[PDB]
Symmetry: C2
């Protein structure tokens, strides 16, 4: 089970040193946003663990004073060659913090600077239960479970047992809509994304994908809660919105934003976790599966778009 | 004095419950971004306080399990009427968490929902030492000092004593460059901002200001570090960059991004904390004063852009 033995080993080694009190997720690029679910998890669920999510550049230049024997550092680099991330592992080990590295390349330079190395599923026919985002999440779940206890551990593991099926079925479900979407937006140059909660990172990554396709302007990834507290992104540019409608504790925040956008007759492509079958996961843990769903369904849309025209 | 006393009272009141262990900053709009320095401060400096920064809507819909008698919740709403932020204070109090509210309007509805209230300076000619961003930072400084102790307390108070004169001087120093910036970019409907570190929220707010002026597309506020690990924002749009060059521990991260934008001849307006005299504040605390510098200098550039051509504080 992802991360369970690794975490066991760390909890054992650090007991003598006062135990694990601080968790740091450190990466760049796609690997940074892929750790947002783990951050959201520990913020919501923990009482005696701190969590920090850091860009590798910022961590190595300005490391927290809590970095030391009561910290664990989880670094991610897909190819295992990102220099700032490697330096982050080194600095952590120099401070006495056990390092877990997440990489797809098991003989990469990063591996020499980690205490533990974990890999994940990637590419063709990837099993979502073992993907990089889910291993990040499982590090947080196991760290909580093995230090303070986690009341919804079994429900979480239930979710892991269901998510691959949910995702691949959703990919088929949206295939046709994706073709239509592609025809409607093929001549747009800018598209905003919108999201909230533990899946927000997947909306950020989708903003990058849109920019990689259109190559015009990197536009905002808008937090659903922020529309009523700033200037509305409604101008004569007529920018459309790719709207991530979550399941779980922030669904109501999303629903309020969506209703607003509809009242102004905006062009909106909605991807809705409730319509794509996520709701079989228990409501105690479903927030944490939004990222894995959307991050794995958007490619169907992105591929259709492309045809119509650091992980 | 006020924030110090407010925090003393909370430490007295919560001692019997095990004391304060968790700090939450909760707000919307500009008040969310102005709390970024306080979040950065506790992440850098604390060993036994958690800190969480939340949008008010997210907080009231998904409050943390640690919200309880060992938590302090700091809320901010300039006009004291933001409904989600009011509900956040209310939810905090129901869980037994002391609430400190920051508002300019001392009889706003927020006030009735807080345990303690701190006001601040605001408007033309204000004393920067007492502005809302600074009161948010002092809440974190005092919470740390009065729980675990803070090794750079005196350096921090020294920086508070300097920040007003630095900003006033800087506002004058940039007057000329602001005029030429306005002329160079009056027809550019999209401009990226770039930043890192504890001042990042001031760059985000500057992104909002640019969009408010140009009203075309709300563009990315790019992190100086992430800049090298994504697709570079360099297209046939030829979008310029408004670059926040921080003082302190992330300056090297900014310098790397700047050197790269230069060595590709992009259009860049550089606003440099070190050129604007921030560095009389000690290296131990200077990170935390970037926001107050940039957030109070940018209006000069914005007023010039405006003359050459809603929002929650």
């Amino acid at each position: 089970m992802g991360m369970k033995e690794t975490v066991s080993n760390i909890v054992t080694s650090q007991a003598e040193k006062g135990g694990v009190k601080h968790v740091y997720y450190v990466a760049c690029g796609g690997s940074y946003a892929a750790f947002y679910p783990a951050k959201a998890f520990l913020e919501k669920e923990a009482k005696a663990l701190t969590v920090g999510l850091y860009n590798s550049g910022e961590f190595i230049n300005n490391p927290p004073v809590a970095l030391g024997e009561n910290a664990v550092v989880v670094v991610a680099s897909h190819k295992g060659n990102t220099p700032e991330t490697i330096k982050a592992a080194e600095i952590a080990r120099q401070h006495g913090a056990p390092v877990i590295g997440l990489t797809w390349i098991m003989d990469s330079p990063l591996v020499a600077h980690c205490d533990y190395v974990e890999t994940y599923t990637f590419g063709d026919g990837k099993d979502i239960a073992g993907e990089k985002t889910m291993k990040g999440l499982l590090s947080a779940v196991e760290l909580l479970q093995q230090t303070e206890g986690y009341a919804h551990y079994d429900d979480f593991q239930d979710g892991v047992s269901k998510i691959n099926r949910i995702v691949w079925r959703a990919c088929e479900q949206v295939a046709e809509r994706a073709q239509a979407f592609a025809q409607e937006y093929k001549d747009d140059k800018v598209i905003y994304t919108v999201a909230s909660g533990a899946g927000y990172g997947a909306a950020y990554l989708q903003s990058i994908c849109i920019f990689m396709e259109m190559q015009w302007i990197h536009s905002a990834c808008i937090h659903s809660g922020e529309f009523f507290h700033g200037p509305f992104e409604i101008t004569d540019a007529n920018t459309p919105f790719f709207f991530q409608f979550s399941e779980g504790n922030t669904r109501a925040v999303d629903e309020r934003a969506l209703n607003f956008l509809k009242k102004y007759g905006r062009r909106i492509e909605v991807v809705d976790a409730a319509a794509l079958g996520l709701s079989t996961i228990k409501t105690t843990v479903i927030d944490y599966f939004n990222h894995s769903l959307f991050n794995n369904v958007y490619p169907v849309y992105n591929r259709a778009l492309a045809e119509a025209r650091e992980y």
